[PDB]
Amino acid sequence: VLQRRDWENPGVTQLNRLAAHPPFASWRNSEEARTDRPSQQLRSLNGEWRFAWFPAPEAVPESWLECDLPEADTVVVPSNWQMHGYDAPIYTNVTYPITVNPPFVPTENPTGCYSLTFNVDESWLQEGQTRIIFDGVNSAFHLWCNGRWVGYGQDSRLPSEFDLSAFLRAGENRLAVMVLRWSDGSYLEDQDMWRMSGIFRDVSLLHKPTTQISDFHVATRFNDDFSRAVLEAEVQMCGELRDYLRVTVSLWQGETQVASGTAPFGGEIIDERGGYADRVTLRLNVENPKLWSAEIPNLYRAVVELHTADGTLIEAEACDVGFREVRIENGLLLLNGKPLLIRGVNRHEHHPLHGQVMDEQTMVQDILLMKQNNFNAVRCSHYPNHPLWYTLCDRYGLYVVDEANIETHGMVPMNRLTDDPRWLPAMSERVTRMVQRDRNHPSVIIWSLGNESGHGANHDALYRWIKSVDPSRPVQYEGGGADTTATDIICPMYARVDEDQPFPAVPKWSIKKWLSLPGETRPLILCEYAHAMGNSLGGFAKYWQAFRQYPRLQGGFVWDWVDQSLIKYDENGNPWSAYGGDFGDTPNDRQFCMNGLVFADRTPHPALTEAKHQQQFFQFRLSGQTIEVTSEYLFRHSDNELLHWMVALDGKPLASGEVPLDVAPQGKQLIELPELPQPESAGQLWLTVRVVQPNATAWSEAGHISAWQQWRLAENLSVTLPAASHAIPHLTTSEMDFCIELGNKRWQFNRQSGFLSQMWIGDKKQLLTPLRDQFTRAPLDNDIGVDEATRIDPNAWVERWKAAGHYQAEAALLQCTADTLADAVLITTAHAWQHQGKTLFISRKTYRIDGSGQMAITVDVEVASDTPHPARIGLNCQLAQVAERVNWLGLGPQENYPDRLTAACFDRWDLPLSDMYTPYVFPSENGLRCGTRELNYGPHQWRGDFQFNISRYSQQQLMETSHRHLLHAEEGTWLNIDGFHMGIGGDDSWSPSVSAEFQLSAGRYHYQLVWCQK
Amino acid sequence: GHYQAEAALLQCTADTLADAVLITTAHAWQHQGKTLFISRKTYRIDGSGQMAITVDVEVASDTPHPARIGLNCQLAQVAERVNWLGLGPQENYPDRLTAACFDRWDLPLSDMYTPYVFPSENGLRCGTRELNYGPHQWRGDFQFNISRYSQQQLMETSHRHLLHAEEGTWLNIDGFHMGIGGDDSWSPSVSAEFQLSAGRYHYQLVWCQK
């Protein structure tokens, strides 16, 4: 064992490991099997185990096999030992966490010694077979039972199983598991995620009779219109063949048996040597079957009884059966005859506390959120999941892409292993043992060959293996250019909608162009798109406009579901979110582990609502009085949906109402609105419709909003002049300052800087920092890309801004004059922002303070055409006032940006100040709200047509601080008011991704604001 | 009512600045009680004899997007040459300007008119920073056409040969101009990005004699 070094041999991926197979419970009562109640023959060995850590496997003492070590501790299993503090988790993306020297791993290979003293019931050893199942061990392990070696296993994401029947004694028993952190297996586990290890999934003991169901496959085929099905169940036995032996496969819907078949063993003749005498295929006819889909996850129950002809049950197995067809026809992925539109998301198995250990609660939590936010599909990025995941997806209704635990991203070139026949054995085990495990789950609709491992001949062989073994499911794979011969689906990652990215060998064509390349017929579903890293998902709507226009663009899987942040603690025992490099870990890829639509604790990022809106299942058109509602549901009718409409003038409700939605799948409903009441005052009428689900479901609460849309109706422009003012403001001129006085209000303009330096209400200052122009933002993740202090990327927006000096450019005053008028004082200014002799921006302003006490600020900016386009064109100032609430008439309520505002609605919004800050773990520009016409904060009111954000953090603190928890609330409130703001992008987070139409490139910019106290 | 919309004055004040005079105005174009467009303007005339016109326009969102947001007038002058710094030499519109080049152009006044057999808007040149005609110079960032033919005469005349040179020179200077379309000629074919849909529009001119 010490001598062999099997963890450094891709030829040895297991020793004495049993065959893979679908979930077994070995029920000895049919009814228990039918109802899926716990099985006395399936014991869990989860809980308190004994664990010790070692620098290498050589440093594991001989005594540990026979005796528990005193140094060892009592830990909970399943667990990742990094999460218990024993060593550091490593976050790396591409570059391997170990030296690239296949198949060799580091001599210093962290070794986790697990042990358990447990009882085996006598009954279990008198008859039948007792096996141990390790659902997840990262990354390789040797197993001993009662001091005797049992076997070895690799592949972190599939169960390893061993027969312990001859190793177990009655009474107390002891398992010894030596878990290696790195193995030849590691070379195929280079996923972009936290690198951890240990026994991290369930450990259990299964008892099976000596004569047993060893394997079983369920299949369902249909007639042309799905009105008749045939369930086909292949069952294989182990043990002695006997004439009295039978299998009954019976199909239940609730408590009704709908079909049943019983046959002896011995299948049809297969070749010249006969057939499988140890197998039987059962064929059941089902009339008018209830079809399975994510829309309506109709399940049947299938119970497979192994028994004597005379009626003695030997054992029962079972699975949920979902009657559905998955085929690709004429270039379209069809489910039950209908073209799918995949509203998907990639989801790693991550928990901020427990690491890579999963639990029902978290999984259920994830499914509900996904379904509540209009997702219908998930990708198992990039390994087979905890077995409960599929059960839940079967039951709640989600399309799953099941992915082999193969990623060799770090290799050079990416297919160095996958094109090497010597790695085919290791690879095949990762594909084949997956298929054997999950093939009966209806929620799995697509098989994937892994992730980011180039395209090698090994992929082609495995592709064909699956197509041969399971015709029911298309096979996809992205490596080597996303459209190789190893994929039934064009599945690129981060291909853009309109923009070609013609990388050599592996181009990412615009998805619209990709479909029509000469000879191409396949459907396109993006395996990864819209990289939700930090403040992101800009341009998301553009994907969905395309998905809907093009039949063969059948959607994609967002990257990704949840931030991979871990929980650390400070001096005071206060929790904070940690990313790459926060564990002494190096080389690291810092915050690249947080691309989630939700935080590690499952709190939504702002972007989640944008996804929810774009992935709506009802589309709307307006034509005068008529709302046309179109259903994008393929199967269900809108039987738990009513339309809630509201007409509002500038946030003020006028008319409302409800209509029940009665829409057939893919059908249309015309809702005729009543004659609307005439709005008195001036303003813009907005119509808002919402789709509300009256009844609670398995996945949502009563009143859950599933879709919404807005339209501008009538606008009555204000023509009424404000009534003339008695008072006239007084200019108090100085060498250094222009003061303007009216009532208790006082305005000061510094004649050396050119900016409003101060305002007074009564005799209290309102500003801590003068009102100045701003052309920069605290850079987003998308602004940064793969840019770091040691490796400069000159093309990332932040570097373009930096090199051009946007951040360090000083305002030179060109002009600052004062004029008194009939009813107003007029301050005129001009500033030039220069860096090293170049003039980047000229800002020409006028400040018109009149008798009403309302300062009308007019701003016109020239931006030099050869300077990189600025992040924003606006003003900032630090206010002295700190209010509890922020109130505005604009897009909201949540954070929105120019290329991410479709989900925001125009209305009157009122939130606490803290909600106006988005706590991105890597702090940046955040909290912006667009199309705002009025902003209120304490005694202040601004009016116009602007974008804004308001917080206790400066753009300077946001860009100088690496983690959210290190931010300190500054004195007063920083306000950012922008006439214009650059898009956030996020088609990926490693190249500039902001589309041309969201870049501030017009050259000349104009916006006007009205500042008044109310 | 875009074609019979009457201008209704809302504000018209003057102020003497330190070194200039400022004329602030506000207009509403109305039809059947509906305000279509509001035009807010400042005219600033300083010692150099330069008239800086600042125009801010509101367009009601529920009115069809207008053909142009600009200014016009009939000049008494009739010159032989038109000289401009902008896209040219030929007629160009926002959705048909890729062939035009930015440069100093000098054409006879006739060339600034396109003789389409059925008369319409014509002769426009876009992205113009300076226009010279006789004594006059206009500066900013605008589009313009310049001819002996008013919009009114063009739209009322069926054939080009029935056209008569009016007295003086009709000038149209647009801050913004709607696309011309053409994907077909039997349904709206002007793309969204070339429709004047923003709701609020700003442009600025400088007028002076040279």
Ligand SMILES: CC(C)S[C@@H]1O[C@H](CO)[C@H](O)[C@H](O)[C@H]1O
């Ligand atoms: C950084 C790119 C060169 S690779 C890029 O990294 C991303 C980071 O979240 C994801 O892991 C993507 O799958 C991968 O293509």
Ligand SMILES: [Mg+2]
């Ligand atoms: Mg090995």
Ligand SMILES: [Mg+2]
């Ligand atoms: Mg990768």
Ligand code: NA
């Ligand atoms: Na489609």
Ligand code: NA
């Ligand atoms: Na990542």
Ligand code: NA
């Ligand atoms: Na930062």
